[PDB]
Every structure is written in C-alpha cells, then in structure tokens.
Amino acid sequence: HSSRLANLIDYKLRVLTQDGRVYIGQLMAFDKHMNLVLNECIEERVVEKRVLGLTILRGEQILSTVVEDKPLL
Amino acid sequence: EHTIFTQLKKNIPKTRYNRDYMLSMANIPERIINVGVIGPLHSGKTSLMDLLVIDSHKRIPDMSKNVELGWKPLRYLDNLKQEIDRGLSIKLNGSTLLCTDLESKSRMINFLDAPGHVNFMDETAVALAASDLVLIVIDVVEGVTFVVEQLIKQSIKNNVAMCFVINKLDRLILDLKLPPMDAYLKLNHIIANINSFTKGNVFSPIDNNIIFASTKLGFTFTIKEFVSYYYAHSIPSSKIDDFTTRLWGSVYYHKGNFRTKPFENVEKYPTFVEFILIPLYKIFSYALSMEKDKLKNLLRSNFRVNLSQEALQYDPQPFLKHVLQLIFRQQTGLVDAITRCYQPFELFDNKTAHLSIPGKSTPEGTLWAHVLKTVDYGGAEWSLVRIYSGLLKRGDTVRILDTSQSESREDDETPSCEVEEIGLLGGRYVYPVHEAHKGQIVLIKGISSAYIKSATLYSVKSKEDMKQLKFFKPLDYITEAVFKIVLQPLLPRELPKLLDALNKISKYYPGVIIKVEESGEHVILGNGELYMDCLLYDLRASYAKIEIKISDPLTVFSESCSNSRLGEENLPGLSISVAAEPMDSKMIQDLSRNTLGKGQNCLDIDGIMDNPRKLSKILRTEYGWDSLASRNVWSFYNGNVLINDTLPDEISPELLSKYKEQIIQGFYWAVKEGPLAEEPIYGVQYKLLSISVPSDVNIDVMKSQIIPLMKKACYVGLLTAIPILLEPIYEVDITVHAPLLPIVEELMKKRRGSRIYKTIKVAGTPLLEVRGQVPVIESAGFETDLRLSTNGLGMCQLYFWHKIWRKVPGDVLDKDAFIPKLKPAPINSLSRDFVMKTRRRKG
Amino acid sequence: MVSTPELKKYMDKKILLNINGSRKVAGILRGYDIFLNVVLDDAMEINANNHQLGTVIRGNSIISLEALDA
Amino acid sequence: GIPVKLLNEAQGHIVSLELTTGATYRGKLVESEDSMNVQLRDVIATEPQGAVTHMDQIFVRGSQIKFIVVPDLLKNAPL
Amino acid sequence: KKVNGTSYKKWSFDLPEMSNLYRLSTPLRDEVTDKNYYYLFDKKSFFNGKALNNAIPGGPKFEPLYPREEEEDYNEFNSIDRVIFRVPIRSEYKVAFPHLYNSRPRSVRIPWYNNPVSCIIQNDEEYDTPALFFDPSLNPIPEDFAPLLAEEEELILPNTKDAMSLYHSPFPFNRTKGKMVRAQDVALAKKWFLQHPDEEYPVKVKVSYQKLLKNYVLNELHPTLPTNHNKTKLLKSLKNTKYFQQTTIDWVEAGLQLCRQGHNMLN
RNA sequence: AAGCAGCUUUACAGAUCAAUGGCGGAGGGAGGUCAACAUCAAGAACUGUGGGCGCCUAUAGAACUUAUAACGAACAUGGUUCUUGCCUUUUACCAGAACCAUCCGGGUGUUGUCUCCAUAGAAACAGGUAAAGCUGUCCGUUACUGUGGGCUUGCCAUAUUUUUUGGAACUUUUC
C-alpha cells in the first residue's frame, strides 16, 4: 500500500519522537524503514526551540505524524 | 560580473541535472573522479563521448535534424574547424560532467577524450597524467593490434586504473555477418588475447572491466546493468548476482538448471550467448526485418517499451538506433563499472608517486597541483590543471613552476602570478568557476605567460612544506619527436611574428620540439607527416598569418662507434686519453624502456640514483657487466654510460673527486653535440684512460679549460673508433584485407625499409595485420602510396616505439663513392652524403 | 547486509575502545567480524587502575574506536 | 530508499548527529553504510552535561543513531 | 499508403519492394560502397588539386588559378647541396597533406583522412546462403525463466537477409521514405565517371573520365542560392484568362500540332 | 506477466440533476500537377519600430561561426571586369578569376477554393491583433457510486545482533 504516505509529501508536519522532542517542517522523502527527511526543522523540547535545517530521522525514534499546514506553493 | 554570467546563461545550453548540485558535490574529495578515454584510430572515442553528452543535456542546439536521427554522426568534443574537416580528433577535449550509477547516486566525473591517432599519442600521454582510469576502446574487428599493446603497457606503466570497452559490435554482426557462435569465440578470443597482455590481473565480462558498445547505434552492455534492466524483474532477488557470475565462460542451464556439463540434452550455446548475443541479434534482425506491431507487442511484452508512430516511421537505420537508444536507458552501466573499478586509497599513492619523488610530506596545509597543458578554446587560451592540494579562487596570487626547473631538484626561485579566471570544460562550451577544489580538473586563465609545456603549480605558506613538497617530472611523451622540417619566413622582415607563432605552438602542442639554428633557419621536430601538417595549418592560419617556407621532410641522425688515443689542452698541463666503445644491445634495449626497476627488468639508468652497488648489481648480474667497470661506472648521459677506467685515476683520486663536475658537465656538453654532425651520440662507452692535471692547479684547472678539452677527447674518441652513423626507423603497422598482400610487398621493397617483420591473421575477419620497419628518412609519402595502391583498403601507421636506431648503410668517410645531385643516393655510399650535407648546414 | 567495516587500517595497531557501561579497553587489533566483534591482544582495562587481561570484545556493545599514535 | 541516499551524499561535508546515548557529534563524514554506520574526523562531541572532547577517528552503529543533520546545499540534490 | 496522393509528391514503401528493386537496379549501379575507397577522387582533393595546380593520374588537369610559377630563388635554404634527396615527392602527396609538401598553399581545403576500411561481406553469388554465414574467407578463429526474444524461435527471416543487403546502399535505396524528383533531376551515369577506370579501357574512355571529372568539378565549385518568390511558373500565370485553354492529348499528337505550329511561325 | 485493491477512463444505471470542477469544443479530415498573396539555410549576441504584462513575441539592418555538411544528394546559359588567346574579328569562342544577371525548380505559411468523406453541435453570443477558443460567457461527458477496459502503482510476504513483534518495567532526589 503506502498510498496515504505519499499524500503527505511536501506538507508541513509535526512529528513526535520516543525521545519526546517534536520536529516540524516540510516532508521531502520517506522510506521503507520510515526514515523521514524534513526541511527547515525545529525541535520543541518542553517555551523552547532550536534551528537545525535538513534533518534525517530514524524509524525507531519516530512515534506519530500530524499535519501542520497544506502543501506550500 | 554575475550579469555577464547571465548573458553566459543562454550560451551553455544548460543541462538536465543543473549545476550547483553537481558543483556542490565537488569539494568532497572522495567523489568526482578523472576518466581518460583512449583507443586506436577510429575506435569511436569521440563518438562515445557524444553519447554521454546526449545522456546529459536535453537542449543541445547544434544538432541538425539530419544528425538527430542518424546518418552523419555527431562530433562534440570535436570543436575545431581542423578536426571537423579532417574527420579525426586532434587536440583532446574533455567534458566535465555529472553522471549517475545504477544505484542512482551520482558521481561528478571529468571526461577526457584523446586522439587515437598514433602521431598524436602525445596527448594520450597528457591524458594519462590526468586520468584516474582510462577506458581503452577497441574496434571489434581488429581486436587488439600492436598499438593497443603499447597502450595498456603504458597505462599500467603509469599505475592507473583501466576498463575496457570493445566496440562497434554493430560492425561485427552486420558487416561480418557472424553466426552467434563465431561471435562468442570472437569476444572471448580477444579477451584472452588481451588478458595475456594484462600483467598481474585478468579482465572478464563479469569483472566489469569489459563493456560492450556500439556508438553509431548508441548502446552499451554491462551484464550487471543489462540483466538488472531486464532479467532482474524475473527471478528472486537472491540468486541474481550469483547469476551474473553464472553468465560468461562456459555455463549452461538446460531447463532452469545451471550445469557446466557439455550442453547435454540438445541445444548448445553458453549462457552469455543465451541471454545476450542471440536476443540482441533478434533485436537487430527483427527491427530491420519485422512488421512494426510484431515488434511492438514484443516491446511491451518482453521489454516494456512503447513506439511512437513517428518512431514507427523511419528509414531502417535511424529507426534502428531509436529502437536501441530506447530499449537501453541513458547508459550508466558504463559509469557503474567505472564507478566501482577505481580505488583511491590503493593506487592514489602509486600514480601520485610515479610522477615525482613519493614522500609523502605536507599533507593538506598547502596548495600544490599539477599543470598539464596550455590549451586553446574558443576564447583564447586556458591552462589545464589537476588539483592535488588546496582551493582556488579568481585573483588568488599563486606561485609557478615548470618541470625542467623541477629537474633542478628560497628567493628568486619562483615566478608567480594570480589565477586570472577559472573555467570548467564543457566541450564546445566553458563553464565559469570561481572556486576550485581538490581532485577536480579545471582550466585557468592568464598563466600561459609563465612557461612552456608541463608546469607544476603550487602556493604554500610553509617553507617547511615548501621544502617538503615534491615536483612532477617533465612528462614522458610516449613517442619521441624524430621528424624534422626547416622553416623560414618567406619575407625575412616577417621573421619576428613567426617566432611568437612558433612559441604558442610549443605551448599548445606538447611533443613538438623547436630549434633556432646558428644559421638562423628555424627547425621543427614532430612525430610524422600528419602531425606536423596539423601544425603547419594552425600555423599558416590561426596564429601567424604569414606565408612561410618549408623544407623536405627530414630525420635526425645520430653518431655511433663500431670497434690509439691522445688529448691535449692548448696549455698542455692536462694529459687526456679517452677511447670509446660500442655498447650492449641488451643495455640498449633496457635503456630504451625507462622504468622504476620493478621485477627482473633491468632498472632504468635513473637507478644509478639507487645504489651504484644496486645499479652495478643489475649491471654485473644481468650483463656480465664488468665488476670493475661497474665500480668504475661514473655517470650516465642523455645517452650511454661514462666510466673512470685506469690506475692513474687511483693515483690522483682526490684531484679527480674535486673536478668530477668539470668532467661530466663537459661530458654532457659533449654527447649533446657530436664530432660528425653535431647530432646526438648513442651506443658509446667511454673508458677514461689517462689524465694529467696542470701543475699544482693555481686556478689552472677550470671548466673553461678541461670542458672543451674532454669535449675533444670524446670527439677523437669516436673518430678513431670506426664511427658509424645512426638512423631511426619508423616501426610500421599495416592493416589489410588478405588477397592484397603481394601489393604491400612491392612497395616495401622500393621504400628500401622493405622489412616485413611479422605477418598476422586477424581472428574471424578477412584481415592481415603486417608489422614492419621502414626508415624515417625513407618514410615520405608512404601512407598515401599504400592508401592509393590498395584502393583505400589497408591502412598505415608509422610509429616510433622502442626507438630502434639502425646503421646508416654507408661508410662515414668515403669521399668518392657519391654520384651527383638530383638523384636518390647509391645505397652503398650514404653516411658520407648525409653527414657532409648536414655539416653544410653546420660547419 | 554484512558490510565489512573499515578496520583494515587498525590491524596490528593500538586502540582505545569505548563500550557499553562507560567501560574502555586498550589493545592490539588482531581481527574483526561482520557484526563488529573484535579480537584484542595485550588487553588492559581502564577502571584509573589498569589491570592486564590478555580478549574478544562483543560487537553490539561497541560505541567507538580511537587511535593512540598517529 | 531516499533517506539513505541523502546520507551518502553528505559524505565529505560537516554533519551533526544525535545518538540514543544522549550525546551529539559534529565533524566531516568520511564513510557511511547501508546499516547507517558512520566514520568522522576532527569530531567535537557534546554530551548531556556539556562536556566537550576531541576524537580523531570515530565509528558508530546505526541502530544507536537517532537523527542526523546535514548541510544546506543538499536540498537541491536529486531525488 | 504508398504515396502522398494525386499530386504524387513524397513517396514511401516497404522492404521487399525495395529489395526487389535494388536487386534489379544493381547491374546499372556498380559503385564502391565506402567513402574510404575514393581518396584523391573525392571533391576536396579535386579543389586542392586545382588551387594548387597538381595533376592526379586519375584526376583532371586544370588551369593554374594562380598564374605564376615564376619566383625561383636559390639561397642558403634551398641549395641542392644542403638538401638530402630521397623519394620523388609525387604530386598526390602534395594533394594529401597540402600544408606539408606543397608550400605556400592558398585557398586549400583540408582533406578527409582515414576511414575504417569497410570489411563488409556480401554474397553476390549464392543466395541460398543463410542470413549469418561464416564466410569461407574469414580467418580460422526455475525452468520458467527464459531468454526474452528467444520466445520467438528463430531470428533469421526471409526478409532479414536483404534487409541487411539494403542496410548498405547508396542514397536512394537505404532510405525507404523520400520525395519526388524531376526525371532529368535524376543523374544515372554520374556514378560511372566517378570510379577508377582500372586498366582494360582504351585511353578514349579514360580521357573521357578526365573530361567528366573536369566538368564535374566545375559544376560543383559554383553554388548560387537565389530564390524566385517573384515568378509564378510561366504556365500557371499565362494559362490565366482566355486565349489558352487546357485539355489532354496523346503526346505524339501534341508533338505534331507543334510541328506545323512553329513550322508555320518560321514561315 | 495473472488476480485483488488504488488511479485513469469508459458503454454506461446512476447522486446532483443546483453552484460547481476536470478534460474537449465556440469553424472538421485527408487529398486535390488547383489557383491567389506572402515567406524561405541555422544559431548566440548589438541597434530601431510595433504589440502584451524590466520581461516576452514579431519585423528590418550590421557583425561573427557552421566544413556553405546540403532551400536542389540538381545544374544551364548570359552580362561586366582581369588575366589568355591570338589577328583576326562576328557567330563568337578557348580557359580560367572576380563580380553581377537570367532560366529551370523546390519548400513553408496564409487565403480562397475543388474532390472524396466524415456525425455532434454549444459549430451560441460579444470583444481584436499580422494570426487563432486569444479572451469572457458558453455547452458535451462529467465533479461521489457498481459492472467493463488500461497502468503510473502496492514493489513481492524477514519474530533470532544495525530500524516494525520492544532492555522493558519501576522507584526516588534536586530546581
């Protein structure tokens, strides 16, 4: 299947991890291991923030996915 | 600045993959690579690069429709009017290019495409020095002929990675009309035939050092790629790579069952033929002979391919291409085998050593890089450089050096200049670059002022590193000049321009060796007819516009001895006796091959820098070389070996160890000149028999004194030695269809070189390769007597390898036997002719 | 799978390994494995009291690997 | 998969990463793997405490990596 | 399907149509396939053979184009006694590397060099030879996956042989799609005075070859590039209005009406 | 490469039978030894004019390149000037060089048509240029279902060390 996962491509996402951090940004690539690639990223540890840039997360570390906004023009 | 770049935008016809992504991958050392490409004449090199270029750009404008389909093949990397009117690549041209692999991860690559013509081997030389690996490309018809042997020998001798591409398979099937089993033993046969010439390894279809192609039809096979594109979607992904290894080399699957057993059951052709040659033949013979729709259903069904009624409607050939170029995809199989076949860690130190003294010292911390070639693109002239250490930007002031001045080994040692501009080579176009990174090859601007020919570049802040860094040899141009033509400007007032004209050539053409005589008449040395022709055209058109004047083709003789003695200073405080000796044809043949002494091979005489016990170990061991002489061996030359041989040497040993510079400097002075023609001396051993030295030497012993003395001692040395006159010989490669052999014989006789040295049949073709010898001075207009006489059949190449020098048939001094002018000279008396003649342009 | 790691350059040389539980070992690198199991000779613990042992370190545990001398 | 290729493409550039250990490493990346092994040079480690260190050559195990952070030019790269 | 339409422009075909056609035409056409055969019989060696005034044995002999051979100077350079005489230095050389032997070349077009020496084999004797036939004159030298096109049993087809024979043809045949030409626009015999005479000829027909190469060069050397956008074909215009009307007829008859027609007008 | 599902359509029964949204259509096909009027090697870059919102498109002039790789895998004659000729001169040539012509053709576009053919129709209306659904309205199926076609798809199936069959669970102190 994986038909739904392609639909998320190029949307701003809110990804919560097992570590607790929540990464935010557009989705450039997705994988068979669930490796996610994110553009212009910001972790939110908690009134807190940090600028990373391009981030490639592992599959083990990811918990859930949630859309922030529609696909950008 | 950037706006003028924008008016550059509409020039370079952009590309699929854009740039800054590629040029972004640039700085990364381990990526990119350098690939040089060489084959003999008409291997398809330049065309192959044409393939890659179209696998790159979308937009390439200058394609006519007429070329798009078909019939006339595109030349891109043939940028010159000269190349385009001739039909053979002359000045090698690359394209810096980004390509991808089967695994899709793209390497930056530097493509270099060399001439194949033997006379131009010079650039292939240069090509080597840059190239991290070469693709040696073969016309499937001639297999590997001698020139190829010399090639691989050279590249391995440069410690550089290889891969092979056998090419023009189309020519095989269509022209030669091979039953498949003919073809398989063809391919095989060649592959063994080459592996024989492959020292310390073997290649093999699965070794992926062998890649199949035809350019004119534009298709490529690496069985990895090939199968993957197709059979991969068939069978479980486990067995696959095994199945690759299951392909070439006598292996059979009867039904789904791989068995090396003879072929039993019934049908017999090996697995290779089974999934490659035959189905291919079906592609050709059908797409020619088959109803389109029949093909179509096979294109979906088997190959998942779709024809457009346009592509449906084509004359047989252009169709047939679009067929293949459609069935196979943007060849990465090539790249892919390249991709995996180069080892940075293993060989990088090998090659990077081969061109200098290894070290290594000063890793990073520095800019030091190797300058090969001064080149002429559409605008003016750039320089071609490979980057070993450091970065570069426009305007950066940097220090300059040349390879001879690195033969020399603080202040004053460096002329320096800034990088005026940096390009990348885009073939017909040049792609501007501000920043240059380690490992990638680029063009510079403004540095042409600095030098001629090969030049080492560096910029370093550390006199530590400065002392520590090393310097590249003067590049070995794999064939020596050997061809001689006197130039005069037709209007001697025009004389100045011609000079700078010549100057630029000595830059733009590596191998040419130019002189200005005492008499004033300029001299040119080049490989052969064609080569120096290309010069003369670029000379009467490009640079100088001056109508000039040209001699008869000429050679460059040499001066030797076939086996008493005095010498005298004009202030006889010196007493010199130096006789001369002919020398070992064994040591001759080993001096001809200049090596690092690897293996039982007699070490190159450079290895006198290795221990004279080590050198004299090679000597005494291999030659029966006299142990005393081996300890008495003093110096080598541009030429033979000099020995201090006498007891009075030991009588006055320190006196000698003071003046040895005077000895040898005077002696290099000697053998460079000569007694007879003032032409080089070869095959001559000087045992130094007697010396006395001015009385108590109060600035009495001087180089001014002893040098021209020992000069004479050498001269008379040869003169009493029964001197003969050395000549070179072009080693001849001739390619013919069989029945014409008698013809060739005739011509050989008349040319008096007349040496049919070997005769050869070519596997599975109606071809004879004949190998022979003909003297350079007798080599005028040979090739066209061939090409006419055989009605275009056959083919001729005159190459100078092994540098073999025969004897001039005459006796050096006999005055009478001559017969008057305006005739070819009588074969019994020559050397007198030649020598008196040159002397008349000399003394 | 089984990408044979780049420990060819460490063979017959000293190391300063780090492992799970913040424990570390010195040794001459003898041999390596698919899963990165290691063979060390002249093995010395680093508690700062150094005990001589003589050793096969397991792959999973490994955090990293250092070189003492250039 | 694309999430692996991106990694291979940042070989040579300078990279930041986070491990299950809790520490982050910053340095030029030399070799990678399909497993997600790493080999870096001139690394500047920074644990939970803030303790800085220098490691000449360093290895990882992919399983232990949480997330990598790669150079900016690698957004124009081909997918 | 076989052509445009009644305006008859722009023909087209299929293979055996050709292969037959070719087979029939071949007696009329004996022409050496490869360019490499022609060497000093090409165009550019004729030009250069003109601008430099050289005489090729099978090439036509022209006028100087540069009137003056006259400047002759001995000099330290030129002297016979400083020049080494071996080999004749035939003219053909001076047509080969014209910047080499023939000094001061002017308006000289740089010739082609070296083609591959076509090894193509063909059977002009036995046509029962199969498609792929090792020539006598060559040197001696799970079960469910399969090869792809081997699905079809045999590659050799009844056409494919002559598909090969047509893979090499001079311009007309190798193309199966092209357009229409005036009858006189076709030149049949131009091929034959481009060829070597060999030997057995009399000097009559040989000298004739030299004539027709001469004329041929001249017909080549002067292109034009006009355009008539002004002139509608004289017929089309003049057939307008009255005094002329259109019909059909037998050819010979119209011939006759003309015979008395202009016969009158002479009178 | 079968089947399932998804996507696109489709003959469709359909929701709506509204506002919608998509694709096409608001002047067909082909062929006319049918004509009229234009135009005609290609390409980057400079200048001028016009149109549309500094950019894009068209036309004219100048420079450079292409092998003059070729409007025609065709070539015929004439004129002026320079070398050639000779005596003759003409007809005129000869034999070249240059520069000008003419003639025989070819291709493209537009327009008007002629022949054989095509089946919905919404081919309906109003705006203008050198051009057109170019624009605005507009209508055909239709935007959400089930039967029928094709694929651009699932990438094709791994609980035992580097991701999806868990080293987790739990407690306590500090700010």
Ligand SMILES: Nc1nc2c(ncn2[C@@H]2O[C@H](COP(=O)(O)OP(=O)(O)OP(=O)(O)O)[C@@H](O)[C@H]2O)c(=O)[nH]1
């Ligand atoms: N039969 C056949 N001939 C080919 C093919 N590809 C190239 N050629 C021939 O190769 C010749 C030109 O070779 P190029 O690739 O252009 O240049 P080259 O092979 O490197 O020769 P050089 O450049 O002088 O070294 C042409 O005569 C082509 O006919 C091919 O695929 N099949």
